[PDB]
Amino acid sequence: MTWETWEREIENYTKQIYKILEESQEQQDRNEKDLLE
Amino acid sequence: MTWETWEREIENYTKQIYKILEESQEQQDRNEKDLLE
Amino acid sequence: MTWETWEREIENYTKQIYKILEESQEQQDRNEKDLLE
Amino acid sequence: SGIVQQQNNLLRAIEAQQHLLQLTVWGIKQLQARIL
Amino acid sequence: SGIVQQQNNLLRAIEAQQHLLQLTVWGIKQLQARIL
Amino acid sequence: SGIVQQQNNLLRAIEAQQHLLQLTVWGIKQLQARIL
């Protein structure tokens, strides 16, 4: 595997992780709101 | 630590986490089924 | 970033994680005890 | 439902991070094979 | 309550680990550039 | 019970991930010491 592919893979998984972290934050938000009310 | 033991520990924790993730996926599916039914 | 600030940041976040996971263990204990009630 | 959904979200995050971790292991091994 | 709070903490742990992952990527890239 | 067990599963995965992270840090430091 080339470092070029390695870099692309790093960027891709990093992008996906941040998407999942955003979803997780949003769901944590919903769950905390639901609990408090 | 040295590179031989490093390689061994990498393999060991890699297998460890794969097993836990597999167990987690199974539990996730079970929880989703139980919630629906 | 330099190798010196890299090392200190690794240490910083490692200590943070240990603290968060210790808290998480304590919470796991509580949730398991709650589950009986 | 929301708690179960969040468990799925956290599982997906950990799985994605494990892929990233495997890439870093590959990179360390690549560099190790050249340097030493 | 307790479950939702623990999900918060697991998420915080995962977020901190993401910082460590990106630091390890930085280190690998620095070494790679050096020896190319 | 299943939800509480899954929380433990995720905690265990994160802890294993942390051990892997610690190993990648060690490897990077070793390479750094040799190259710099």
TrEMBL record, chains D, E, F:
Source taxon at top rank: Viruses
Membrane topology note: Single-pass type I membrane protein
Subcellular location: Virion membrane; Host cell membrane; Host endosome membrane
Signal peptide residues on this chain, from the entry's feature table: none
Designated name of the protein: Transmembrane protein gp41
Organism per entry: Human immunodeficiency virus type 1 (HIV-1)
Whole-protein coverage range: 554 to 589 of 864
